[PDB]
């Protein structure tokens, strides 16, 4: 009976510290390790849920789950029914809920065979799913015993292979240890560190099955919880509230695993075109006379900038909706004249309200009070903390009433200064004290019998009492949702007080935060391991279905140096969200305060960039369509090459352009993977070893400090765009295509095209759409859809890479082109040409 091997042995004391005597008096066994792996661990006859009066409908199925005998928790659950809905081929759902009583629900919008098959154990409980191509098993929750507590839900289950990647936010590689590993979700306010529960909480993993294919898991609940991974492997979900609401998607590529997830809690938005631009902000630009002269100094260095940003400097004694009159007097004419010169305007909006100011003086404050907007207390009245302002409220965005006030206070705002969006900071939400300034009521939300390994070893650290009252439930519950309903409430004032698309960049966050907003990844020190540990961080977010995501190019925290800088300018240059930001004491870092050599280097990154506009805005609209990544792993595009399942210090943009950046001072050349193919040096591309020939194989590469390793994959072709220091600039210029051949002389690649910024684009047809082919020495375009948005859009260069004899002749719509040139070394043939991307051309040469 208590023969268990040590990788198989769930913990039994998950609550406490326990004797050996009490262990057994649990019904459990005591075996200690010799050297974690839990000491006192559940027999496989431990008291668990026994299965019963199972039936089929056309939906699926349904059961009642009896435990007979106590756990060691309160308040167990006796009677649970089990409800399990076969929604589609390739996603099962089933919950396991009180019948008696109504408890806790996140809010959510809602040959022929599945690709799944489920069974059940009878005594004890289990749920079992294969993938009926290959009989493996993916999920069996038959391992451990089904606790279902008041304030205690545990479901474990044995993981198909050693390899899964998820269960955000956290400092680590994409893909977890199994090696007795505790990951925590109870969103915080702590600059990332390996070990903590950070800002975000996503309770959703993808695990790897040998041989290429995969699964993944949702469990819909906001809870504090634990999520406890050993090497067996196996997993336990441990939350301390809720129901469980389990999805299984069944890919099986991990692409489509990916894509299924965001069809449940909602695909991407789109971004506007300029939100790709370059951002630049610092906590410490303290007038709009010193923020002006970042714009100059960009512009006069040739540095392009679309965004400009303030962090708490513009307000009025750190207050949101106000402007300080010194420093920021004429805010108004500042943003009036970015706007102006093409350029948009962002800036810093905290949750908290100011509730210290007299009566009648500070308007969010006073209506939010009159309106009722505030999470509140024991007695009825608002919950007061501490942050930037002093005491403050805090708006509870569960509550209709509140949101229409924040579309109010937006509106309003945005009627003195016309700024472009909402930089959404401190949403955990942070407090500067513990609870509130009248702490907070002892109860079983404040301490309840399982408290999760977050930092600070309570629920109260660095946030508002638990037990505090929103509109829809407690806090205890819909902590981790404050981040997500703020983005909500944000994305919806300023759809109304802009009418085009909103632009919210949002530092906590809860699954399905990328159908409304983009994400920062926080207080980053400006560190090579944090600029490591930046990639498989970005990666594990357009993963999780927000893919505009970056961190704070250069780091935030500390000072930078000029070589990081340079490394950092890099690889952020293809961060999806790219803004460089930095703190109030720092060192500056914006990219003119450098020496020249570093200033080219960072100047080529971000021509680059700009350049690839065009192709990244396609990425972005695929995501917003079809739920694809952006930015993505290897393993994502390659899964049947194993190879590539733990790395993370590369990063593909789409599927054909690979980054290859070098993340350690002093280096001169880099090492990375380069899957099965052939890769052409991007750097062969004139922008205003030529291929690697792979077998699945690892290349070392030269990488000066002016350099960064970017390759594009034959039989791929990228559409491109003239140069601008800002978007309304770059977006007028002449396009061109880059043409990446197969051996055979293959390739494919499209463009999406639309205004830029308008709402409802895909459903009122607003937007061009081309594909190009090449085959046969011959490139032509695909009309897919021709709008009047795509009329005039201007292609005068097409570069073909992997040309291997040189031509005699190169034809554009059957006449002789003007000039091209050819490079017998490098296999390039660059053509000028004259036309248009929404024009059917046919290009040939021989
Ligand atoms: C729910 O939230 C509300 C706020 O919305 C919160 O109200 C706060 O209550 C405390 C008392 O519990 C108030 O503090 C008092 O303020 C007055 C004057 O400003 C003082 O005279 C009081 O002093 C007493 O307590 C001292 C202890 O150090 C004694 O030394 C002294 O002799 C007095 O007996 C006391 O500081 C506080 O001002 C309000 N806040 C606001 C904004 O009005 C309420 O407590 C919360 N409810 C729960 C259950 O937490
Ligand atoms: C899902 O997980 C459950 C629990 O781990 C698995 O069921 C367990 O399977 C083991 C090993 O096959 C069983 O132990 C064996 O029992 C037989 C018969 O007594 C004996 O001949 C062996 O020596 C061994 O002890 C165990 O009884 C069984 N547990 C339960 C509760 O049924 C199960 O196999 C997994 N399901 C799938 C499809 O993988
Ligand atoms: C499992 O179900 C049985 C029978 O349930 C009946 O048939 C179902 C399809 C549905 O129509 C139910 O409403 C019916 O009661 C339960 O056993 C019955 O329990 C009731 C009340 O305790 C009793 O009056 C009946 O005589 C019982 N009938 C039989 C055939 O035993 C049983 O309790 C269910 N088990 C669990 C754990 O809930
Ligand atoms: C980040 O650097 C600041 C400033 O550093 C100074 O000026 C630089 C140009 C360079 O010459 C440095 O060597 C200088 O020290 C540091 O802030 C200073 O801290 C020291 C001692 O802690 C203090 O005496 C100075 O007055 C501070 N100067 C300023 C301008 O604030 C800061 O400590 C560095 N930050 C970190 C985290 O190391
Ligand atoms: C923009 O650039 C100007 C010029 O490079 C900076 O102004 C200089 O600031 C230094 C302080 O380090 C002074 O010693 C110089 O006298 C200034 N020169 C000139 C010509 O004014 C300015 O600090 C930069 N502003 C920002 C926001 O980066
Ligand atoms: O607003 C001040 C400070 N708060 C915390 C944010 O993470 C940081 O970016 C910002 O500069
Ligand atoms: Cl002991
Ligand atoms: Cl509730
Ligand atoms: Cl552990
Ligand atoms: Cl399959
Ligand atoms: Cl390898
Ligand atoms: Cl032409």
Not at 619 to 645: C, N
Not at 804 to 821: E, R
Request: glycine share 8%; with cysteine; charged share 15%.
């Amino acid at each position: 009976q208590c023969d268990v091997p040590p990788n198989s042995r769930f913990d039994c004391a998950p609550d406490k510290a326990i004797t050996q005597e009490q262990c057994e008096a649990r019904g459990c066994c005591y075996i200690p390790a010799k050297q974690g792996q839990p000491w006192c661990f559940f027999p496989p006859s431990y008291p668990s849920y026994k299965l019963e009066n199972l039936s089929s409908s056309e939906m699926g199925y349904t059961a009642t789950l009896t435990r007979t005998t106590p756990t060691f928790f309160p308040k167990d659950i006796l009677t649970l029914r089990l409800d399990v809905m076969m929604e589609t081929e390739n996603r099962l759902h089933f919950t396991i809920k009180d019948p008696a009583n109504r408890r806790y629900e996140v809010p959510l919008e809602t040959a022929p065979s599945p690709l799944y098959s489920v069974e059940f154990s009878e005594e004890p409980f289990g749920v079992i799913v294969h993938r009926q191509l290959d009989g493996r098993v993916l999920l069996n929750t038959t391992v451990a015993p089904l606790f279902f507590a008041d304030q205690f839900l545990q479901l474990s289950t044995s993981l198909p292979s050693q390899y899964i990647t998820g269960l955000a936010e956290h400092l680590s590689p994409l893909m977890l240890s199994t090696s007795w590993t505790r990951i925590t979700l109870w969103n915080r306010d702590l600059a990332p560190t390996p070990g903590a529960n950070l800002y975000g909480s996503h309770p959703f993993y993808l695990a790897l099955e040998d041989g290429g294919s995969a699964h993944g898991v949702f469990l819909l609940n906001s809870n504090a919880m634990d999520v406890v991974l050993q090497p067996s492997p196996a997993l336990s979900w441990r939350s301390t509230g809720g129901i469980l609401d389990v999805y299984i998607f069944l890919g099986p590529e991990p692409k489509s695993v990916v894509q299924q997830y965001l069809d449940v809690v909602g695909y991407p938005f789109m971004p506007p075109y300029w939100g790709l631009g370059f951002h630049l902000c610092r906590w410490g630009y303290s007038s709009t006379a010193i923020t002006r002269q970042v714009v100059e100094n960009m512009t006069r260095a040739h540095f392009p900038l679309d965004v400009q940003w303030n962090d708490l400097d513009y307000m009025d004694s750190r207050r949101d909706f106000t402007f300080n009159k010194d420093g920021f007097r004429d805010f108004p004419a500042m943003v009036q004249e970015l706007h102006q010169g093409g350029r948009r305007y962002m800036m810093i909006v905290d949750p908290a309200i100011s509730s210290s100011g007299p009566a009648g003086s500070y308007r969010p404050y006073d209506e939010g009070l009159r309106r009722g907007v505030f999470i509140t207390n024991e007695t009825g009245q608002p919950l007061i903390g501490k942050v930037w302002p002093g005491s403050t409220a805090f708006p509870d965005f569960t509550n209709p009433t509140a949101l229409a006030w924040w579309e109010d206070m937006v509106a309003e705002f945005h009627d003195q200064v016309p700024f472009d969006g909402m930089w959404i900071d401190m949403n955990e939400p942070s407090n500067f004290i513990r609870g509130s300034e009248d702490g907070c009521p002892n109860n079983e939300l404040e301490n309840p019998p399982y408290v999760p390994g977050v930092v600070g070893g309570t629920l109260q650290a660095a946030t508002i009492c638990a037990s505090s009252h929103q509109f829809l439930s407690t806090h205890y519950n819909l902590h981790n949702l404050y981040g997500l309903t703020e983005a909500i409430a944000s994305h919806r004032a300023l759809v109304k007080a802009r009418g085009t698309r909103p632009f919210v960049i949002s530092r906590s966050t809860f699954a399905g935060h990328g159908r409304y907003a983009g994400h920062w990844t926080g207080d980053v020190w400006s560190s090579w391991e944090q600029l490591a540990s930046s990639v498989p961080e970005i990666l594990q977010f357009n993963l999780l279905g927000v893919p505009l995501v970056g961190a704070d190019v250069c780091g935030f925290l500390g000072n930078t140096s000029e070589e990081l800088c340079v490394r950092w300018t890099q690889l952020g240059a293809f961060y999806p969200f790219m803004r460089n930001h930095n703190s109030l004491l720092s060192l500056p870092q914006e990219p003119y305060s450098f020496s020249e050599p570093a200033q080219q280097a960072m100047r080529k990154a971000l021509t680059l960039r700009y350049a690839l506009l065009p192709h990244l805005y396609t990425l972005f609209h695929q995501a917003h369509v079809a739920g694809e990544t952006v930015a993505r792993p290897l393993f994502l595009e390659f899964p049947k090459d194993s190879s590539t399942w733990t790395v993370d210090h590369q990063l593909l943009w789409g599927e054909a352009l690979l980054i290859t950046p070098v993340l350690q001072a002093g280096k001169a050349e880099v090492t990375g993977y380069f899957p099965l193919g052939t890769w052409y040096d991007l750097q062969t591309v004139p922008i205003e070893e030529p291929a690697i020939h792979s077998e699945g194989q690892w290349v070392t590469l030269p990488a000066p400090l002016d350099t960064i390793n970017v390759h594009l994959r034959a039989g791929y072709i990228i559409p491109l765009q003239g140069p601008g220091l800002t978007t309304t600039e770059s977006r007028q210029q002449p396009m061109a295509l880059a043409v990446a051949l197969t051996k055979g002389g293959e390739a494919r690649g499209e463009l999406f095209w639309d205004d830029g910024e308008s709402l409802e684009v895909l459903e009122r047809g607003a937007y061009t759409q081309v594909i190009f082919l090449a085959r046969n020495n011959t490139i032509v375009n695909e009309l897919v859809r021709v709008t009047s948005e795509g009329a005039g859009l201007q292609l005068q260069k097409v570069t073909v890479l992997g040309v291997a004899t040189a031509p005699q002749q190169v034809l554009s719509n059957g006449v002789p082109v003007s000039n091209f040139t050819y490079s017998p070394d490098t296999k390039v043939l660059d053509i000028c040409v004259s036309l248009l991307m929404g024009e059917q051309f046919l290009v040939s040469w021989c």
